[PDB]
Amino acid sequence: GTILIDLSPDDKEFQSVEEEMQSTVREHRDGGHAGGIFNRYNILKIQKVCNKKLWERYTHRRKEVSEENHNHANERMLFHGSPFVNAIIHKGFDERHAYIGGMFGAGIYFAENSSKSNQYVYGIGGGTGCPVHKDRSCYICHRQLLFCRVTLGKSFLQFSA
Amino acid sequence: MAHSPPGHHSVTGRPSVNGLALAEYVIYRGEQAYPEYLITYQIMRPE
Ligand SMILES: O=c1cc(-c2ccc(O)c(O)c2)oc2ccccc12
Ligand SMILES: [Zn+2]
Numbered sequence: 001g002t003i004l005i006d007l008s009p010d011d012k013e014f015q016s017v018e019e020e021m022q023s024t025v026r027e028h029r030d031g032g033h034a035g036g037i038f039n040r041y042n043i044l045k046i047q048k049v050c051n052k053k054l055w056e057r058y059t060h061r062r063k064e065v066s067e068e069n070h071n072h073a074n075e076r077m078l079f080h081g082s083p084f085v086n087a088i089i090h091k092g093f094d095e096r097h098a099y100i101g102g103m104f105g106a107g108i109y110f111a112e113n114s115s116k117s118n119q120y121v122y123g124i125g126g127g128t129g130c131p132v133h134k135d136r137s138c139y140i141c142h143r144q145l146l147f148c149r150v151t152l153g154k155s156f157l158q159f160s161a
Numbered sequence: 162m163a164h165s166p167p168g169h170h171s172v173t174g175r176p177s178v179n180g181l182a183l184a185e186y187v188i189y190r191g192e193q194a195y196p197e198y199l200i201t202y203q204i205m206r207p208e
Pocket of ligand 1: 079080081082083084096097098099109110111116117120124185
């Protein structure tokens with residue numbers, strides 16, 4: 001049920017998503033090991049993901065959370081990077097997309113920094129880099145990230161490094 | 162997949178060392194997220 005619509009570079013929505021992508025690049029403490037060395041991206045394409053069933057599944061849960069939390073979903077737009085982004089856009093998030101070894105337990109992880117999600121595009125820790133050149137810093141090969149809508153509700157604040 | 166802490170719907174991982182890092186978040190139900198945009202890109206080699 002999923003379709004992908006190309007946004008024109010002239011479109012304000014392309015421009016605001018490119019800006020959140022470009023503006024939330026940071027340096028990482030691994031010096032680029034996991035995601036590569038770069039300060040900016042060459043954005044080749046931005047596509048809107050539309051799937052009716054997955055959207056309704058999201059809004060249902062969003063209402064349950066909201067009603068348990070004085071009518072506040074606490075919704076955010078956050079990045080997600082993975083070798084399975086082509087499965088996620090078709091079947092949605094589920095326990096197969098969970099980071100069993102993550103710092104906050106077995107769940108599904110999202111980032112405010114685009115460059116944090118870029119570290120997971122070729123796998124946990126960047127895996128072995130691009131399929132074609134085996135390069136975690138490949139400048140030739142095309143990469144893909146998801147920019148996602150996420151419901152936090154009453155969030156348990158974990159302080160951490 | 163684990164459960165969220167009793168009385169809560171997600172976890173916020175607040176950075177408490179790297180002052181430039183933004184937050185990270187964890188949900189325990191896949192239904193709490195929706196993939197809005199697919200972005201195709203190259204990282205650019207600094208000049
Ligand atoms: O975008 C992320 C993807 C993933 C991720 C981790 C393990 C996986 O098997 C996966 O499919 C995605 O982890 C993150 C951790 C912190 C912040 C963002 C991410
Ligand atoms: Zn490559």
